[PDB]
Design a protein around this nucleic acid. Structure first.
Lengths: 96, 184, 196, 167
RNA sequence: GGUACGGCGGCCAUAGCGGGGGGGCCACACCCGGUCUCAUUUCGAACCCGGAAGUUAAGCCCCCCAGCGAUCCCGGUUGUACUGCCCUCCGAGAGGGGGCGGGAAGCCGGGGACGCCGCCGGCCA
RNA sequence: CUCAGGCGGGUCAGGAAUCCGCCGUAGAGUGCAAGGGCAAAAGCCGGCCUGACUGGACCCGUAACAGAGGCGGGUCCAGC
């Protein structure tokens, strides 16, 4: 039986959280900032349901191309085409 | 009964003034069991006996066997603290003979009993509104610094050394007022 | 702890000092926060800014400054003392240069007419503007200290032992509970003269 | 019942979750310990399989009955301890026959899935009845669908098969 | 610059839980009383207001431990289990094997671990 | 403000009515399947309210890569 893709389709372990990590995260990730042209990983935080990108892109590295409101604009390369995402910084991580 | 540690624990109470506990609250419950005019009668009874307002304790879950429905006001209760609580406890404990079962004490030196008919400065004014007379009375003790676990800010847990025990509670009751029995 | 699935809260939450849910909302603004805290005998007012390594406090004021540097002879845990400390911290912040801040009463309840809001009124009067609504401040007479003087007069009219127990430290320090409003006006005058 | 060669091998995924397997049958073997489990017996004869296998509950029960009767007859209730170390968890299903249409099978039995060099059963006994223990192990091995061997261990647990048999 | 002082924080158990000893310059507490501010679906219990008669018994602060929990290093099991690429290598089959490249989990033994950092003030100086 | 469940105590009251202590990492609840997330809360109890609104922009998913009418969702500007 074919099943169409939904937001939380086959994310039982991907969006799960460690038992010792329960609760809200530390505020550093919430309050972090990035600059245009920076490269950032996408690590979704399950406990924060706003500004969440599609779990399809969880674990990918993108480029910051601006910031509207509180969310950052991340440009990513899916296959060969370009996709723009709006992600809250809590879901993002700097690339060292 | 007989407490073997009375002497050295007396040395302890006298040596450490802050180790002396006190009755923080006496709770009196009237389990009326039904939401009728008897409930109001018990409410007014405890109002004129204690002097403060009652509380309508509702029923959790529904049980047809006892003729109760969830959320129905069934029983009432009142909490007494301070010197007025001391006086009320004295008169209530005098109501019945000044004897307490030695086994009724909890693990943390908390004791309580029940009275199946008003007898404490009772007043024969029961025909107008009475009939549900009967009261579960439990007393709680505490060494002074137990508000650490009650205050919201910087709440902490008291160690095992600083909390009461059954023997200390019964000896405190004996020393202050009243006597124990061997309950058989 | 019980096992591997036991979640130990943050250190500050375990100690019951910081409300992280409110911390996040306060820090979202990005402006400096005027942190106000109170003890059994003293008040603390500070101006703090965020720093991921650890938040940095720029201007801080303690109520011992009132007793030593400027001269105070009253209990440092009352609404008038809170107002004086708020005025002092506002003047200090304006001297520092910062012009705006947001109040931070920690995990104290927001009950109107309290010491924290007395500090807020003192700061806004000093000049450091903080968003607020005037209805939360304590009464002007309360800030001037009329309540303590009234209680002292009532106690003196009543049995004097109650008055002695209540204010056994003021008399030895050398201050009568009466004329406290005059003492407050004197301290206010010296503060304004020094800072203006 | 179908031939045991159908279920002999372990190529299929494990099928154990009774919360989701509907109509799964109940065990036909309910006794796993016989004799004197508290007794102190010097030697322990264990039967090992030489390859991954699945042993049906029917084979387990047949071996249990044969070995228990033999040991009871030739040793005595209190002079041995016979144990079956493996419980049947795998569920064996068969196609309900339509033909090959909607062919998912329905539960028909259950079996125990065993890995290489794993122990199936153990007989603890003293030096007097070691030959009886060995014969019982051989009789049990005669009832299983794979190749099996037997080993003799002391109370420490080190193999002494060759030395004990030679002596 | 000293301090068995506090406030705001970072990593968020190698930091926790549970125990033993010691302390109160200042400071933090317990503690005393509810006229006023504030509140009890009753209760000054909590929250709030007014203080210092008393106590370091508790919180708090300093030093110690390996009982539970967590987690770091070393040795054994062990290059074991598992696995990527090639194969005219062995097997009736299942499945194994050679060369090159990776490499556990759990358990056993010995150490570690009763937190480490940032900013600013109080008291002394 | 903190739950389920449990231990000890208490007149009627019993396994189960209402109450007093201790333990309690969620073993409760969150309208409804399952999964994920939630402890000074997203749960329980209350106060006020109707942003379940108007005019628009851009972006992701159904439909990876790789085309789409209709639809769902996300990030925002302005008005009230």
């Amino acid at each position: 039986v074919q099943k169409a893709h939904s937001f939380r389709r086959k994310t039982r372990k991907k969006l799960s959280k460690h038992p010792r990590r329960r609760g809200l995260p530390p505020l550093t990730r919430f309050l972090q900032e990035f600059e245009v042209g920076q490269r950032v990983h996408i690590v979704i935080e399950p406990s924060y349901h706003k500004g969440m990108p599609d779990p399809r892109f969880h674990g990918r590295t993108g480029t910051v191309v601006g910031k509207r409101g509180e969310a950052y604009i991340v440009e990513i390369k899916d296959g060969s085409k370009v996709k723009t995402l709006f992600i809250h910084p809590v879901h993002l991580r700097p690339q060292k | 009964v007989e407490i073997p540690n009375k002497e050295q624990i007396l040395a302890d109470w006298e040596a450490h003034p802050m180790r002396r506990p006190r009755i923080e609250k006496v709770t009196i419950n009237i389990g009326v069991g039904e939401s009728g005019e008897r409930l109001t009668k018990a409410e007014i009874m405890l109002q004129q006996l204690t002097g403060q307002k009652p509380i309508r304790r509702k029923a959790k879950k529904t049980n047809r066997d006892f003729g109760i429905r969830r959320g129905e006001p069934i029983a009432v209760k009142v909490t007494l603290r301070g010197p007025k609580a001391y006086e009320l406890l004295k008169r209530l404990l005098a109501a019945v003979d000044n004897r307490l079962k030695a086994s009724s004490f909890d693990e943390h030196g908390n004791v309580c009993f029940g009275i199946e008919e008003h007898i404490n400065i009772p007043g024969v004014e029961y025909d107008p509104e009475i009939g549900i007379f009967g009261m579960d009375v439990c007393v709680t003790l505490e060494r002074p610094g137990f508000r650490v676990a009650r205050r919201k800010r910087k709440r902490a847990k008291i160690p095992t050394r600083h909390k009461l025990t059954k023997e200390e509670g019964m000896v405190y009751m004996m020393e202050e007022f009243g006597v124990e029995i061997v309950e058989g | 702890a019980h096992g591997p699935r036991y979640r130990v809260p943050f250190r500050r939450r375990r100690e019951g000092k910081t409300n992280y849910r409110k911390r996040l909302k306060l820090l979202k603004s990005g402006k400096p926060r005027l942190v106000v805290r109170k003890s059994l005998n003293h008040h603390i007012a500070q101006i703090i800014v965020y720093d991921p390594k650890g938040d940095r406090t720029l201007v801080s004021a303690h109520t011992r400054e009132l007793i030593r540097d400027f001269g105070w002879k009253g209990h440092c845990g009352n609404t008038p003392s809170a107002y004086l400390l708020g005025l002092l911290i506002g003047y200090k912040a304006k001297q520092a240069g910062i012009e705006e801040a947001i109040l931070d009463i920690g995990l104290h309840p927001p009950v109107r007419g309290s010491s924290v809001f007395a500090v807020l009124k003192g700061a806004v009067d000093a000049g450091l503007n903080v968003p607020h609504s005037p209805e939360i401040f304590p009464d002007e007479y309360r800030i001037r200290g009329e309540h303590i003087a009234e209680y002292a007069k009532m106690l003196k009219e009543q049995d004097e032992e109650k008055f002695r127990r209540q204010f056994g430290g003021y008399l030895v320090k050398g201050l009568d509970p009466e004329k406290l409003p005059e003492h407050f006006e004197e301290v206010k005058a010296r503060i304004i003269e020094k800072f203006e | 019942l179908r031939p045991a060669k159908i279920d002999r091998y372990v190529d299929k995924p494990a099928y154990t979750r009774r919360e989701y397997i509907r109509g799964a049958p109940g065990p036909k073997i309910t006794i796993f310990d016989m004799g004197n489990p508290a007794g102190d017996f010097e030697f322990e004869v264990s039967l090992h399989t030489a390859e991954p296998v699945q042993i049906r509950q029917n084979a387990l029960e047949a071996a249990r009955q044969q070995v228990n009767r033999y040991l009871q007859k030739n040793v005595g209730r209190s002079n041995y301890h016979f144990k079956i170390r493996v419980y049947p968890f795998q569920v064996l299903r068969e196609n309900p026959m339509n033909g090959m249409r909607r062919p998912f099978g329905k539960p028909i039995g259950l079996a125990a899935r065993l890995k290489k060099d794993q122990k199936i059963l153990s007989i603890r006994v003293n030096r007097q009845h070691l030959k009886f223990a060995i014969e019982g192990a051989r009789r049990a091995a005669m009832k299983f669908p794979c190749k099996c061997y037997y080993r003799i261990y002391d109370k420490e647990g080190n193999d002494v098969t060759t030395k004990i048999l030679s002596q």
